[PDB]
Amino acid sequence: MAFPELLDRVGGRGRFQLLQAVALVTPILWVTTQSMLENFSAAVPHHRCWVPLLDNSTSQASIPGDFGRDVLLAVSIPPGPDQRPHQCLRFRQPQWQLIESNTTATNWSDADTEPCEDGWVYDHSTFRSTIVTTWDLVCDSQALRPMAQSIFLAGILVGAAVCGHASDRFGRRRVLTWSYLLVSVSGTIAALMPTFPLYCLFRFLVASAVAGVMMNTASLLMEWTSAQAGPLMMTLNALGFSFGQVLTGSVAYGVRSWRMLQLAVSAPFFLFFVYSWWLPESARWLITVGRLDQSLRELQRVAAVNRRKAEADTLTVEVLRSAMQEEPNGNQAGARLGTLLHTPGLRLRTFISMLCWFAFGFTFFGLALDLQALGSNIFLLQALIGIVDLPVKMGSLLLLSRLGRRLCQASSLVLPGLCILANILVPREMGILRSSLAVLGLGSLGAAFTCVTIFSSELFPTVIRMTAVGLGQVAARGGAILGPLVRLLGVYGSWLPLLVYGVVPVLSGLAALLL
Ligand SMILES: CCc1nc2ccccn2c1C(=O)c1cc(Br)c(O)c(C#N)c1
């Protein structure tokens, strides 16, 4: 009297699971928007130093001679490496001699300049306001954007662990509902904080609650369906993220103020919390705990939804108790973690799987948060990453059965990897080729997440299936944290952030051939 018999009795495929899939895949879009909002709410616009001659109208009325703004800009700001007015320093004493062309304007000492003690002036053509504009994340404070992104990712990790324990102890639907509420409230609060550390802390809390939402949605979606229909709903969950990227691009185009954007993104989660109550709790977990009457209630409700009351009429507590007894025990938790690495055969298999899990977080999140440097129109780039993800993800699974198993993993990492390395070599003059390659790079890098998830289970023995995936997700989260921090190497050179992000997938993909 195992649970699958009962689930087949009530109805495994019809109606109810479709509605549940809709109601649980809709929030994934807004989860993706919350995750990728940092690309728009923290965009760094073009800026230059504050100059009394230009910015101040009181000094504007005192200008001797009607000189054009370009001449004043050349006078007051030293030239920069890219022929632009240099960003982080200013002329002390209005240099009039620069007007004359008789002197080669190249002999300038570092003692002739001062740091911008009077703030900056930013460009407001595209973005009305970001966090960089508000709190002056410029010059000496340019290292605090990857800090914010790493704090958010660490929040995801800690929230995943804590919510895992809490959902294993209390249930699925309850933790999911309270996670919806926490996301909404924490986002609404974060949209109003005046100082940077408060913003970082509330983004941390939002990330924790988001991790809880994703985990509980995945588990509750898996536990209510027959084993034949698992990968189909995994594919639906995967497509949710691509539609979420498209939605992120659209909403970012709609609103161009970071506080309003954050409020608009964090608003619907309260609505999700409101109707999260009507969902039924997973019957398998209810059977495991020992509250049989609640299990019978959920089973009868979901059977009545599918119009299968006649088969539900025969359900009694005895078969539920038999299913309780048949459920395997998990006392072995302390044992499988060591056995994964202590086994000589399993030591190498895990590590290469670990390295493949590591490479996804390091490369994808290090680049998907820096679309400003890969092109001009970041509204269009966000849409295309979601668009290209659809044909590639579905088109890849065809090659699984035909081209084999071990070859798919190697191609799923090398080929997106070489797209990024080609971005360095190609001249910046051909911008269209630069942008199209980056779309195909990160667009095809998402297919690695799906292929590895499916392949992880089949290799390992049935005993250690769950624990093997548990390690794999940890390296993805731990690797993603180190992603943004690499951008701090950009001071040495422009090509260094791209070089490291391209070498890791090539080594990860080629090393997977030993599996
Ligand atoms: C914020 C998560 C996220 N944002 C995007 C944006 C585009 C494509 C995919 N994602 C994801 C994930 O798929 C993902 C990452 C890690 Br790290 C996890 O631990 C889990 C879990 N559980 C899920």
User: What are the DSSP calls for 341-353, one per residue?
Assistant: HHSHHHHHHHHHH
Q: Give every CB contact of residue 217 below 8 A, 6+ residues apart in sequence.
A: 24, 27, 28, 176, 237
Closest ligand 1 atom to 210 CA: 1
Q: Is 480 in the pocket of ligand 1 (CB under 6 A)?
A: yes
Question: What is the Rg, in whole angstroms, of the alpha carbon atoms belonging to the chain?
Answer: 28
Distance 71 CA to ligand 1 centre (A): 50
Q: Give every CB contact of residue 300 below 8 A, 6+ residues apart in sequence.
A: 312, 315
- H or E segment to which residue 131 belongs: helix 131-135
Rounded CA separation 322/327 (Å): 9
Residue located nearest, by CA, to atom 1 of ligand 1: 35
* 314, two tokens: 């025969």
Instruction: Write down the CATH superfamily of domain 332-515.
Output: MFS general substrate transporter like domains (1.20.1250.20)
Rounded CA separation 506/455 (Å): 19
Experimental method: cryo-EM
Topology of the domain comprising 1-42+138-327: Growth Hormone; Chain: A; (1.20.1250)
Q: Which of 34, 156, 442, 445 to mutate to test the pocket of ligand 1 (most atoms within 8 A of CB)?
A: 156
Distance 75 CA to ligand 1 centre (A): 49
Rounded CA separation 359/379 (Å): 26
Q: Is 300 in the pocket of ligand 1 (CB under 6 A)?
A: no
Rounded CA separation 428/417 (Å): 19
| Identity at 200, one-letter amino acid code | C
Burial class (CB in 10 A: 0-12, 13-18, 19+), 500: middle
Mind spelling out the 3-state secondary structure of 145-193?
Answer: HHHHHHHHHHHHHHHHHHHHHHHHHHCCHHHHHHHHHHHHHHHHHHCCC
Q: Is 241 in the pocket of ligand 1 (CB under 6 A)?
A: yes
Count of CA atoms in the C-beta half-sphere (13 A) of 358: 19
* Number of helices and strands in the chain (H, E): 25, 4
3-class SS of residue 427: coil
Distance 356 CA to ligand 1 centre (A): 15
Residue located nearest, by CA, to atom 12 of ligand 1: 241
Cβ 46 vs Cβ 123: under 8 Å: yes
Residues linked to residue 114 through DSSP beta bridges, in sequence order:
90
| Identity at 257, one-letter amino acid code | S
Q: Is 361 in the pocket of ligand 1 (CB under 6 A)?
A: yes
Rounded CA separation 70/266 (Å): 43
* 186, two tokens: 């924490």
- For the chain, the domains span 1-42+138-327, 47-122, 332-515
Name the residue among 458, 471, 161 with its Cα closest to residue 337: 471
Q: Is 215 in the pocket of ligand 1 (CB under 6 A)?
A: yes
Does the fold of domain 332-515 match that of domain 1-42+138-327?
A: yes
Q: Give every CB contact of residue 246 below 8 A, 6+ residues apart in sequence.
A: 382, 383, 386, 387
Rounded CA separation 191/210 (Å): 16
* 221, two tokens: 């979606």
* 72, two tokens: 């004043």
Q: Any idea what DSSP says for residue 90? A: E
Q: Is 473 in the pocket of ligand 1 (CB under 6 A)?
A: yes
